[PDB]
Symmetry: D3
């Protein structure tokens, strides 16, 4: 089951991300139940927006918010909700919402799966448009939800990202 | 696995439905094997029709036909086969086929996932067109299958639906 | 889980095939991890080609290459990656790659699921165009991958196919 | 522009069919406006059904009901509404609702060889023929038709010719 | 050909809307070239958003900004870019970026009954009305607009009439 | 109407490309009929391959093979068959089957900035350039071509100019 998926081959350089929401999909926010490993519908997004990247999490990680580390993974084509992709950390989007601090990692597919992201070694190597869309997205997707708000603080490098993976992995024990 | 999915949070008001066939999909009738929890192809429908709603079942229920209670769930967008959605009972379509009596529940997404179905508290609140299409569908999808026939008897309220859920849940023990 | 799926109802006549790649899909090569039963992204194909059939494997089989027997399954509509379909053996495509000998079976949906393939009792009954596309595909999909090469040797009948299923099934014990 | 398309290269064997509705598509019934040649939305179908084949007409034809000869064209993939496809007549589904007829035509061999074996109505897959009948029999239920039967390639050609001359 | 489409059967109650952008589609902003009538790619949207409704214009109309009256049309399924749909005005979303207005129209009852109950702007689903405002408010962020509010069916008709006469 | 589209705003730097085949679509080869301007089905491809880019031509051009200059245009999302997109030439893939050439053009900066960095053929992603070569090299296998190589933006412009003047 997805529950048995490893955090990665060689953390924090080599990780697996369990996909929950494909890029460019209909406004359905899926989430993998951590008890059954099944794909649950979290909710139908209220805004007319779509995820700019595939969104998921790293298994066997535990962050301060109590949940696993979530990651955005750009790929040539949208992935199946519930699939596992091997990728590597390149940065982190830092923000704050009605609950407190939030941080989402950005990771690109591993060289074994494609050589299109080999030159992307850090947050500053990602296409600027993409970065702008990701920020804009998180900053506005919950707008039609009363009580929820998001403020994008900024981006951090691969080091900070790998830092979060290792911290959260050790903490998950 | 899907096999471990609960019948619901608070039966019969709050239930989870395991989706097998998305709305508006290609003529493939999927079914979750109750032994493996895997999605099996039951058959390729012979008629040029499509399910008007997402179709699935409530786990941990056992009706008189020997199988779990099946439900039709309307949503804004088609759901992934094998996903679990939290919804609530609003009515039941009663019919008879070559095997005997058959009844399929209609349930709408729970308020947590969307507020579009809050005003739909009973079978009589559902759009008439939708009800007509659901009946028409079940009454004709097996037409090109020799030996199978369906006759729609009628609709019943939320009470009758919740009655079926509770009966079948207790019976599943 | 998919890991618990049987090789078939009555080998080698009646088998189940676990689907990994749907026909006519985007260039993503999926693969079911044999440890978790989860769907992993193997890689993004480099060529501008798509699988002519649904591609998967028979569970509980072990061939000489160390992996389960893989099968190509034509259907009216593309199947969900990770679904299980009941079909029957009609032939085998024989070829050789940079690793050595390779053979892929062709199987058509079982009569229970559809009556469109009943007249297809052997490799020679398959549409010639289809056979040409399958061969062409395997012969060129890895062209943009340095080190990999494929040479199609030829087709064999239902007998040879059933032979491979039985050998690999017994060997998997 | 779509209005300027000919009935075909060589009636009634070789014809051009203007596609209005694609096979396996959403229940939106489009129709080319004979005045502008633009694609109009005729109506949203009310039954949960889809056309088992692409659906269109042969331009420059006039059947007794005042409309051009309409045809169903099976293809390996759905065509674009408003595209034109070269085919050859293979049969006609007769029915009554007055009297109505829908021809079946397959892609001309210049576009594909997948249909060379289908010379007549009987050559068409039984299931396909059965899905077409059922569809036309039931798609207007929530709004009626009775399927009379199938007629041959010659009958199909006869309908094309009559309607074409009749259009002149 | 698309240029030859009329403003409608009976302005301002019964109108034809030429669809340029489908609902829920990829972020590609198309626009019909008023000179050729062909479908041009205006630009690729930079925000991760999609039109909650089909978007187009009423031919033969001229608003103050030199363009025809643009309309948003909700349908059960996305329409084809370049298709024409018969509708009836139900409201207008006002905003400023000069001043801008976007009418909302629903499918004419001849195409569907699903909207007969929507006689006015208030009849439209609150969420739908809220997604339209937010979209127009935020889709050009990465390239600005301020939503003033919603006006009624009468206001909508008034805009159609003025722009139509103004086009003459 | 599609016949009335110009070759571009400013040849050979700024050109309009009429798209006939979308990127990543079903193996249906469409082509705009130069007589009606309607979208015709040329044939159903027999190989399991798809165009890695949108494919079309520059209207009002006449290459030596009697056809207009054909172009491949990479976009973030597949375009609609029959739409027109403003681009700028960046290269040309040469081959022999007589001699054949296919220009590559990217979206004009007015539509997107995602391609401003691609000034020449070498600027195009190696993989993309490699998928285009392989595709044209193998798509007609089940029905032949040999890829000669890639030429620059200047070579591309030269082809546009010659064919345009030649069309006059």
């Amino acid at each position: 089951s997805l529950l048995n998926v490893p955090a990665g081959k060689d953390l924090p350089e080599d990780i697996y991300v369990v996909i929950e929401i494909p890029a460019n999909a209909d406004p359905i926010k899926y989430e993998i139940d951590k008890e059954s490993g099944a794909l649950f519908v979290d909710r139908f997004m209220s805004t007319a927006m779509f995820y700019p990247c595939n969104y998921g999490y790293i298994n066997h990680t535990l962050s301060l918010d109590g949940d696993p580390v979530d990651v955005l993974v750009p790929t040539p084509y949208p992935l199946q909700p519930g699939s596992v992709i091997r990728c590597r950390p390149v940065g982190v989007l830092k923000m704050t919402d009605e609950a407190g601090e939030d941080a989402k990692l950005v990771a690109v597919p591993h060289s074994k799966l494609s050589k299109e992201y080999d030159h992307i070694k850090d947050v500053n190597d990602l296409p600027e448009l993409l970065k702008a869309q990701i920020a804009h997205f998180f900053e506005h997707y919950k707008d039609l939800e009363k009580g929820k708000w998001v403020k994008v603080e900024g981006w951090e490098n691969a080091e900070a990202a790998k830092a979060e993976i290792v911290a959260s992995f050790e903490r998950a024990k």
